[PDB]
Amino acid sequence: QVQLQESGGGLVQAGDSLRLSCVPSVRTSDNYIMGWFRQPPGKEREFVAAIRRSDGTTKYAASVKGRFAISRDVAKNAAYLQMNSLKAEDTAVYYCAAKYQSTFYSTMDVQYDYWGQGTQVTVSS
Amino acid sequence: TTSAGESADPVTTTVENYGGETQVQRRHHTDVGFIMDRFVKINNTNPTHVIDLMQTHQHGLVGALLRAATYYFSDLEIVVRHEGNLTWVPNGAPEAALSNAGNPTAYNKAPFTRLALPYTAPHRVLATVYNGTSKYTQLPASFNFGAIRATDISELLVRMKRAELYCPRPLLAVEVTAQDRHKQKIIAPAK
Amino acid sequence: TTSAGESADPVTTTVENYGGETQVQRRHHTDVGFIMDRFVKINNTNPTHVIDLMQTHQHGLVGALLRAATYYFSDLEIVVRHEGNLTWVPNGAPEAALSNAGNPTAYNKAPFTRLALPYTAPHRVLATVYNGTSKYTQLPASFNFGAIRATDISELLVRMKRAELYCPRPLLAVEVTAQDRHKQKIIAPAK
Amino acid sequence: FDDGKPYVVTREDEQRLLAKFDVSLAAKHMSNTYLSGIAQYYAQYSGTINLHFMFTGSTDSKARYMVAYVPPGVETPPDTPERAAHCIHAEWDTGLNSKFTFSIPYVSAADYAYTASDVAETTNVQGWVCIYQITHGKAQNDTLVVSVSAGKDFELRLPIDPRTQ
Amino acid sequence: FDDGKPYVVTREDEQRLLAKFDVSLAAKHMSNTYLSGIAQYYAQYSGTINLHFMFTGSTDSKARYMVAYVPPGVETPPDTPERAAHCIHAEWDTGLNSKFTFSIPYVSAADYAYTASDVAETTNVQGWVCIYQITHGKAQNDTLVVSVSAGKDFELRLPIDPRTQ
Amino acid sequence: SGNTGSIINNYYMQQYQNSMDTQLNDWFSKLASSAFSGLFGALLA
Amino acid sequence: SGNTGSIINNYYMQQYQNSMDTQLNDWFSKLASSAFSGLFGALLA
Amino acid sequence: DRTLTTRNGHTTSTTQSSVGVTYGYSTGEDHVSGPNTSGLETRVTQAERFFKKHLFNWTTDKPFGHLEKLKLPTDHKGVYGHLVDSFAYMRNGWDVEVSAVGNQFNGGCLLVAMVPEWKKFTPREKYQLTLFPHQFISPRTNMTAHITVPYLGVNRYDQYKKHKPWTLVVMVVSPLTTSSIGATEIKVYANIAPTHVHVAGELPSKE
Amino acid sequence: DRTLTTRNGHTTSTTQSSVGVTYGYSTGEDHVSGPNTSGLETRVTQAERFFKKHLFNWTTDKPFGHLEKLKLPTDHKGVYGHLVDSFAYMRNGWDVEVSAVGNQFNGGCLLVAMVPEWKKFTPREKYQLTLFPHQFISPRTNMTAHITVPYLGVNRYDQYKKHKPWTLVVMVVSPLTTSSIGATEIKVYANIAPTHVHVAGELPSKE
């Protein structure tokens, strides 16, 4: 059905910033929730930040609350995760996701539908 | 046909002017009551939303065809997808009235809620433009259909019932940059 | 009966020619409107599908009986099994119109969706074969019933309503390789 | 017919049996017909089936033909017109009118018949149709074209969808 | 028209072709019209399309114009009124009445036409409309304003919602 | 009227269930009914 | 009566389905029907 | 009894081996004036007349199923041709007459049919070519077939440089058999004439 | 009051400086069906429509008696042309309309006449050019002349590749006088349309 195209990964060192992007392949008229999951080396996947398509309702993790910022482009049908002031612990594999089926805030970080192959972000010190 | 242009009278020449034949036409699809009667999206919802029709997208079907009129009258239907109960207060109500169940409150069923609301504005007609103010770019605050409230609202749809439009205004199309015409992809079967 | 063969006139001899008796017949099941009115599968669905009836299987009941006519007219019914919403745009629409909810959009209920669509092609009849082109093996791109779109579509069924067929064409059966007749297994109770 | 021709040719032999085929819409001879192409999509049938015989020989070539309906009850069909003269048949020679239509009767036990032969079980449930060459004069390579259409009371009954898809 | 003006100016040249545009509600010349702004929200159309020509030159300036409908079937439109005189056309000069209305016919194969041109495929499905300057006397910078409205049997058919939102 | 078996009228108007035909002839029915039968020439039953 | 396609009457009264208009004229229909057609001056067909 | 004369315009064609006229799908045209042409169509009676065309040589080494086609309209050099390249939309039916002259001491059968919206036939589909308006040419009986067909298509008017609705087809049903006193070869010709020629949408000139 | 619209076929032409229509020698055609064509003539209504032509530039240095002619039929690139080269005998009249657009602050006079069986005029014979169907173009009053003439000749049908009965003539009567506020030059165009086009004797093709 829907495939996700990720962009903007790479390598930085501590203190810099990165910008991740993700655009879905089809532009159906749904209320999907673009989110970001990260999987640290030798650990399991976990939620980072999500955003709703209709409004700019953003969820966040306790780890990254003041640093990270997520936004959406209504025109280009995109979503961007602006990572700021990276820590050496932010090294992981970052995945996007879709979650088309239900769009309520209380469940905005539990069950996504389409993932799309992850990007590699490896910050140094 | 030749006529006085500066007088601004309407002139409708036919193909009969050179032997043709005007054919029978059916204009059921450009009827004002017909074309405005479809659900269209409102893409900025809040925990508390004031139903203002000028919040429809300006380039949608209903959004643009509504911007192409100065005044209008309509009832309304809304399709809300919410968590918890949904309270509706009419036009003119305090904002604190939205926390009580004496007002129309809908206890949420599974998919969503579909209601029909009347026209409660104190004016005979509503307007899309206003030249001036109403206190002692921005329309008067009484140009709305009420307000809704839930713990969080996911989507809102609206539908104009018994719609009436007055005093038409410009309605534009996408502009052609350098082509001879605006070319785009049209649906066609595979293979 | 004996007749001039090369004149190509139809001749129907009876069993009365040698003492028999023509019996009463009922042909309700070979009625064109009756036999084409059943749901048949479309086995190539996409996230975006353009409804073209020449995508039914060529050896199915409706597929083959449709290939056995030059022209046809029909309304339509579709049964779609999708995720998310299902948008439908009529014949002639841009492909970008399929991302907006001003068009017929179906919010998915549990099992599937069953709709009824009209005939929106600009021609009086559609065709299964075309001898030539339409731009300045492949039919014109205007030979369709619209397009649908969802995040992914699992199955699509179509049904022809008020079907009319014109100008019949060859309709073949499976060929017999070396036998005296084509023998196959027929249902029979166990034991 | 054999070699995939719509016609049977007169034979310079002692054999007077031109062609023979089962009364079945699934026969090898009817595999390329419209009646068969329609009948493949139904379960049962009943009624008349017409055969047309068009002679395409020269003017100086004469012949006399015969067609017989051999209902089921014998193991093998007859191969002599003298022996098949005891069935339902018809004879006709060649002349000004070059076409001849013979109507196969629907004679059976049940009111309907299957439009598909079940399995490798032999001896078709309905009979056979046997075309004979009574005689011919100076007709060495002249042919007789055969075609089939539905009768006045023909009928197909129960729609199905049997092909592998 | 060119430079984004509602009018065409007489030319001190050998060229007698003022303007030319496709018969399409998605044309570059109709991009700023109300007929086009409405027609963008429908799939198909049919019927008449009226053009109005208002002359805004002085009293001491005369001219004679011509408009032709060039249906599809040629690769390039004609650029001479002598060659475009074989289409459907009309001529008119300037005088007391400063307006002129010409009605574009709906002539095609199908009963309806798309209100949107498909892809970079060339040679618009409907024809062109060509405005010519037959002659003019002492009309150096005088203009001719063009506008369009719907005809008596015009019609839009199937509502859609095609804009990116 | 093919393959519809309910006796009650439809809930929706005819204008919405399907499209409407406008005006401005079964060939093969007449071509089969006008077929030749009987015999040709004389008969001696 | 725009975009409603059921033949059966409504289950709810008119007083509850929508509001009620009180009293105390299509301009553009008349402005288009009163348009000029034909010709001006004489004709030589 | 089998003497027929057809007159199309100022042209006639007589045959004494007539077997009848076959009407396909209709005995007369439907409404030529519709809403798509907006009252601006006209009829041309100078274009409705016969013109010749050579189809094929019927030799004895051609087996059953040998197909020859001719898409209509063809390359016309007369008034019909200037009509086709002078107007944008045309419509007309056809009145076809095929002749294969040998002698009565030949044998064989030809199938002359008019197929709408031609597409190449598979070897098994040629057994059903008699689903279209057709006639047979048997040297035993006749030398001339005659079919008359209306105009049909998805559109009421056609652009013949883009689409060809009709196609004339001649198939060998029974191979030609000759003897010492029969014609060793047969040449097949067509005599076609458009019917009810209506035009619309005059085009600019090229000069 | 001086507004005229002529519609010939699917083509129109409006003028607001009309001065009337001049009929020459007849107000309508005579018998188109005669004994020389033996009942085999037909009328073509698709050929009766306007086509443009450029006559001359009316400058101030052209004195009285400056003659410009245009023999009709001209080199036609549309349906009329294929008619002329497709049939052997034709006949039709003419409906001519000449326009010389300057402005009302010019001076001069033009003579637009339709001369049958043209022959070159001597300088003294140009004083009598008003014996033929004619009109004047004076920038003072009008910008458009309009004459309508029937078909005439020694024969009822004509072979236009051999004979041209009619000729359009424009003569300078009074030289163009311009001022600082008048048009310094005037270009003259013709808008001609055949009338009652009948043809006979279809010709073979060239292809």
Q: Which two tokens stand for residue G5?
A: 């396609």
Query: Bridge partners of C156?
Result: C42, C80
Question: From CA D16, how far away is CA D84, in angstroms rounded?
Answer: 11
Q: Which two tokens stand for residue D15?
A: 């054999």
User: Which of E148, E134, E147, E137 is CA-nearest to residue E57?
Assistant: E137
Provide, as residue numbers in chain C, all residues whose Cβ is less than 8 Å from the Cβ of D164: 59
Q: Do the Cβ atoms of E62 and I101 come within 8 Å?
A: yes
Residue B33 near residue B165, CB atoms below 8 Å: no
Residue I136, φ and ψ in degrees, nearest 5 = -115, 145
End-to-end C-alpha distance for chain A, whole angstroms: 40
Q: List G residues 1-45 in contact with I (Cβ-Cβ < 8 A).
A: 39-45
Is it the case that chain G and chain A have 3 or more CB pairs lying under 8 Å apart?
no
Percentage helix, strand, coil for chain F under 3-state DSSP, each rounded to 5: 25, 5, 70
Question: Which of A31, A74, A104 comes nearest B152 by C-beta?
Answer: A104
Q: Which two tokens stand for residue C28?
A: 């309700």
User: Which of H79, B29, D134, B166 is CA-nearest to residue I207?
Assistant: H79
Question: From CA H15, how far away is CA H38, in angstroms rounded?
Answer: 42
| CA within 13 Å, CB half, B42 | 22
Question: From CA I9, how far away is CA I3, in angstroms rounded?
Answer: 20
Residue E137 near residue I184, CB atoms below 8 Å: no
CA-to-CA separations, E160 to B8, B170, C74, E84, I85, in angstroms, rounded: 33, 19, 22, 37, 51
CA-to-CA separations, A36 to A24, A33, A71, in angstroms, rounded: 14, 10, 12
CA distance C89 to chain A (A): 13
CA distance B16 to chain I (A): 9
Residue C90 near residue E158, CB atoms below 8 Å: yes
Instruction: Return the ∠ at Cα H92 (arms to H86 and H98), rounded to 5°.
Output: 115
Q: Do the Cβ atoms of I45 and H42 come within 8 Å?
A: yes
Question: CB-based contact (8 Å) between C151 and chain A?
Answer: yes
H-helix or E-strand containing F15?
helix F14-17
Residue A24 near residue A98, CB atoms below 8 Å: yes
Provide, as residue numbers in chain H, all residues whose Cβ is less than 8 Å from the Cβ of B16: 39
User: Which of A42, A47, A40, A44 is CA-nearest to residue A97?
Assistant: A47
Question: From CA H37, how far away is CA E106, in angstroms rounded?
Answer: 7
Closest residue on chain H to B25 (Cα): H35
Provide, as residue numbers in chain C, all residues whose Cβ is less than 8 Å from the Cβ of E160: 89-90, 93-94, 97, 102-103
Q: Do the Cβ atoms of A55 and B83 come within 8 Å?
A: no
CA distance C73 to chain A (A): 30
Question: From CA D143, how far away is CA H177, in angstroms rounded?
Answer: 10
Residue D159, φ and ψ in degrees, nearest 5 = -70, 135
Residue C55, φ and ψ in degrees, nearest 5 = -100, 0
H-helix or E-strand containing C61?
helix C61-67
Residue D72 near residue D123, CB atoms below 8 Å: yes
User: Which of I146, I111, I141 is CA-nearest to residue I5?
Assistant: I146
User: Which of E55, E53, E90, E52 is CA-nearest to residue E69?
Assistant: E90
Q: Is B34 helix (H, G, I), strand (E, B) or coil?
A: helix
Query: Bridge partners of B41?
Result: B157
CA distance H174 to chain D (A): 7
How many CB atoms lie under 10 A from the CB of residue B64?
22
Provide, as residue numbers in chain B, all residues whose Cβ is less than 8 Å from the Cβ of I9: 18-19
Question: From CA D95, how far away is CA H167, in angstroms rounded?
Answer: 34
Provide, as residue numbers in chain B, all residues whose Cβ is less than 8 Å from the Cβ of H39: 15-16, 19-23
Question: From CA I147, how far away is CA I137, in angstroms rounded?
Answer: 12
Closest residue on chain B to A108 (Cα): B154
SS (H, E, C) chain E: CHHHCCEEECCCCCCCEEEEEECCCCECCCCCCHHHHHHCCECEEECCEEEEEEECCCCCCEEEEEEEEECCCCCCCCCCHHHHCCCEEEEEECCCCCEEEEEECCCCCCCCEECCECCCCCCCCCCEEEEEEEEEECCCCCEEEEEEEECCCCEECCECCCCCC
Question: From CA F42, how far away is CA E46, in angstroms rounded?
Answer: 63
Is it the case that chain D and chain H have 3 or more CB pairs lying under 8 Å apart?
yes
Q: Do the Cβ atoms of A1 and C149 come within 8 Å?
A: no
Question: Which of D6, D58, D143 comes nearest H127 by C-beta?
Answer: D6
Question: Which of C2, C6, C181 comes nearest D92 by C-beta?
Answer: C2
Residue E27 near residue E129, CB atoms below 8 Å: no
Q: How was this structure determined?
A: cryo-EM
Superfamily of domain G1-45: Capsid protein VP4 superfamily, Picornavirus (4.10.90.10)
Residue E155 near residue E79, CB atoms below 8 Å: no
Domain boundary assignment for chain G? 1-45
Residue with tokens 């299964």: C128
Q: Do the Cβ atoms of E86 and H161 come within 8 Å?
A: no
Provide, as residue numbers in chain C, all residues whose Cβ is less than 8 Å from the Cβ of D100: 1-2
Residue E57 near residue E141, CB atoms below 8 Å: no
Provide, as residue numbers in chain B, all residues whose Cβ is less than 8 Å from the Cβ of A105: 83, 152
Q: Do the Cβ atoms of F24 and H26 come within 8 Å?
A: no
Question: CB-based contact (8 Å) between B18 and chain I?
Answer: yes
Question: From CA G40, how far away is CA G43, in angstroms rounded?
Answer: 8
CA distance B97 to chain A (A): 24
Residue E57 near residue E94, CB atoms below 8 Å: yes
Q: Do the Cβ atoms of F27 and H25 come within 8 Å?
A: yes
**Hey, which chains touch G, using 3+ CB pairs under 8 Å?**
B, F, I
Closest residue on chain B to G32 (Cα): B10
Question: From CA A20, how far away is CA A3, in angstroms rounded?
Answer: 16
Q: List F residues 1-45 in contact with C (Cβ-Cβ < 8 A).
A: 1-4, 17-19, 28, 31-32, 34-41
Q: Do the Cβ atoms of C10 and F35 come within 8 Å?
A: yes
Q: Do the Cβ atoms of H204 and E88 come within 8 Å?
A: no
Question: From CA G15, how far away is CA G19, in angstroms rounded?
Answer: 7
CA distance B190 to chain E (A): 15
- DSSP H helices in B28-134: 32-35, 61-67
Q: Is A3 helix (H, G, I), strand (E, B) or coil?
A: coil
End-to-end C-alpha distance for chain E, whole angstroms: 29
Question: CB-based contact (8 Å) between H25 and chain F?
Answer: yes
For the CA atoms of chain E, what is the radius of gyration? 17
Handedness of CA D74, D79, D82, D86 (dihedral sign): positive
Residues in chain E: 165
Residues of I with CB under 8 A from a CB of B: 3, 5, 7, 9-12, 14, 16
Provide, as residue numbers in chain H, all residues whose Cβ is less than 8 Å from the Cβ of F24: 31, 34-35
Question: From CA H4, how far away is CA D58, in angstroms rounded?
Answer: 23
Question: From CA H120, how far away is CA H73, in angstroms rounded?
Answer: 18
Question: In units of Å, what resolution does this entry have?
Answer: 2.9
Question: Which of D5, D59, D147 comes nearest H140 by C-beta?
Answer: D59
CA distance H26 to chain I (A): 28
Q: Is D36 helix (H, G, I), strand (E, B) or coil?
A: helix
Q: Which two tokens stand for residue C94?
A: 């841009």
Chain centroid to CA B18: how far? Answer: 42
Residues of E with CB under 8 A from a CB of I: 58-64, 66, 80-97, 100, 102, 105, 134-139
Question: From CA G14, how far away is CA H140, in angstroms rounded?
Answer: 83
Which residue numbers in chain F precede an interruption (C–N > 2.5 Å)?
A: 24
Residue E25 near residue E39, CB atoms below 8 Å: yes
| For helices H79-86 and I79-86, angle between their N-to-C axes, nearest 10 degrees | 170
Q: Is D122 helix (H, G, I), strand (E, B) or coil?
A: coil
Is it the case that chain H and chain A have 3 or more CB pairs lying under 8 Å apart?
no
Question: From CA C41, how far away is CA C79, in angstroms rounded?
Answer: 9
Question: CB-based contact (8 Å) between I75 and chain H?
Answer: yes
Q: List G residues 1-45 in contact with F (Cβ-Cβ < 8 A).
A: 5-8
H-helix or E-strand containing D55?
strand D49-55
Residue E114 near residue E24, CB atoms below 8 Å: no
SS (H, E, C) H175-194: EEECCCCCCCCEEEEEEEEE
> What string of DSSP letters covers I81-105?
HHHHHHEEEEEEEEEEEEEE---TT
CA distance H89 to chain B (A): 16
Q: Which two tokens stand for residue E74?
A: 């040629």
Residue E82, φ and ψ in degrees, nearest 5 = -65, -30
Q: Which two tokens stand for residue A76?
A: 């280009």
Cβ partners under 8 Å of residue E99, min gap 6: B2, B3, B4, B5, B11, E52, E53, E54, E55
Question: Which of C14, C31, C168 comes nearest F37 by C-beta?
Answer: C14
Question: From CA I141, how far away is CA I17, in angstroms rounded?
Answer: 7
Question: Which of E68, E77, E109 comes nearest H159 by C-beta?
Answer: E109
Residue H75 near residue D22, CB atoms below 8 Å: no
Is it the case that chain I and chain E have 3 or more CB pairs lying under 8 Å apart?
yes
CA distance B74 to chain H (A): 37
Cβ partners under 8 Å of residue A32, min gap 6: A24, A53, A98, A99, A100, A103
Is the previous residue joined to H73 through a cis bond, with omega within 30 degrees of 0?
Answer: yes
Q: Do the Cβ atoms of I104 and E62 come within 8 Å?
A: yes
**Hey, which chains touch I, using 3+ CB pairs under 8 Å?**
B, E, G, H
